[PDB]
């Protein structure tokens, strides 16, 4: 019995988003890649650096903002672009959100030595696709 990071529906009581409701045998079929970079094409150097940067970036961006990610990140990547567009809960003040957006801009742009502009798309709740 294969169980990936997919959803195992217990009752009609679990609000699930579009992303978690697709198993990784649907990736080229019905889904989209979270990050996108040319590091996996051939030929290309600097691959494992790109992966450790994505993993540390996503775990940092989650563990900093407490519950302020409705889903995982979108790390589009174009040379000197580490472009953030995430989906946040409409709970807290936008003053605090701009504080934290500038905070992540400064910290990431001085840690990984790259121009970063953040973008947010606020969502009023957890986004749901299925009660699965």
Instruction: Report the site for another protein in 49-88 (rule: CB under 8 A).
Output: 49-52, 54-56, 58, 60, 63-64, 66, 70-71, 74, 76-81, 83-85, 87
Q: If binding is defined by CB under 8 A, does position 12 make contact with another protein? A: no
Q: Out of 7, 15, 33, 69, which residue is the one contacting another protein (CB under 8 A)?
A: 33
Is residue 8 involved in binding another protein (CB under 8 A)? no
Q: What tokens were used for 48?
A: 């494992």
Taking the complex as a whole, the smallest distance from the CB of residue 13 to another protein amounts, in Å, to: 17
Could you tell me which residues are beta bridge partners of residue 83?
Answer: 76
């Amino acid at each position: 019995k294969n169980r990936a990071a997919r959803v195992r529906v217990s009752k009609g009581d679990k609000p699930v988003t579009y992303e978690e409701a697709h198993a990784p045998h649907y990736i080229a079929h019905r889904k989209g890649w979270l990050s996108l970079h040319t590091g996996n094409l051939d030929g290309e150097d600097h691959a494992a650096e790109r992966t450790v940067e994505d993993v540390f970036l996503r775990k940092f961006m989650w563990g900093t903002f407490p519950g302020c990610l409705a889903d995982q990140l979108v790390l589009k990547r174009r040379g000197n672009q580490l472009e953030i567009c995430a989906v946040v809960l409409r709970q807290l003040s936008p003053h605090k959100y701009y504080f934290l957006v500038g905070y992540s801009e400064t910290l990431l742009s001085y840690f990984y030595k790259c121009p970063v502009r953040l973008h947010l798309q606020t969502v009023p709740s957890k986004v749901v696709y299925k009660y699965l």
